[PDB]
Each structure stands twice: as structure tokens, then as C-alpha cells.
């Protein structure tokens, strides 16, 4: 089909890795925010967020109804990882 590429965002649902559920938006909200939302520090202790049991970038916004899972830390992987942004 047509590779889904930014096609009018929409209200999606993201289930926490604890079971809890949250509201998000496709190409609007990310796994970094969802966590950030929680008591400051949670997202602080994160690495790579899994979206639908698939590696997802914290800077990358979800795509649709999927599950969020914060990793404790990388484990046999390189290249695919955040990039030191400006200022810090």
C-alpha cells in the first residue's frame, strides 16, 4: 500500500509498560513525552522506547495505537540510538 507518511494526525492510545493507558496522537506525541508526563525522573531513567514491541525513538512520535515500553539500557546494538543534541 501507500507508505504511511504524515497523513492527518489522529488521537491514538498508548498503553504504559505497567498496564496503565494514556492518550496520544499520531505524529504528535512521542514516548519521551508520555514518560516525561510522569513524575520528573522516569523519562530521565530511559533509553529506547518500544512501540508495539519494536524499537522506537524517543524523539520519534508514535504512529498509532501501540504499546510503550521504556528500556533500562541498550543491549547489543549500535548506530541506532539518540544523538547528542545542541546544548548538552
From Swiss-Prot:
What highest taxon heads this organism's lineage?
Answer: Eukaryota
Q: Which residue intervals define the domain TGS in the entry?
A: 8-72
Compartment list: Cytoplasm
PTM comment: ISGylated.
* Quaternary structure annotation from Swiss-Prot or TrEMBL: Homodimer.
Q: Which family does it belong to?
A: Belongs to the class-II aminoacyl-tRNA synthetase family.
The free-text function statement in the UniProt record for this protein reads: Catalyzes the attachment of threonine to tRNA(Thr) in a two-step reaction: threonine is first activated by ATP to form Thr-AMP and then transferred to the acceptor end of tRNA(Thr). Also edits incorrectly charged tRNA(Thr) via its editing domain, at the post-transfer stage.
User: Which disease?
Assistant: Trichothiodystrophy 7, non-photosensitive: A form of trichothiodystrophy, a disease characterized by sulfur-deficient brittle hair and multisystem variable abnormalities. The spectrum of clinical features varies from mild disease with only hair involvement to severe disease with cutaneous, neurologic and profound developmental defects. Ichthyosis, intellectual and developmental disabilities, decreased fertility, abnormal characteristics at birth, ocular abnormalities, short stature, and infections are common manifestations.
Per its record, how is this protein called by name?
A: Threonine--tRNA ligase 1, cytoplasmic
- Please tell me the species this chain comes from: Homo sapiens
This chain is encoded by the gene named TARS1
Range of the intact protein held here: 79 to 153 of 723
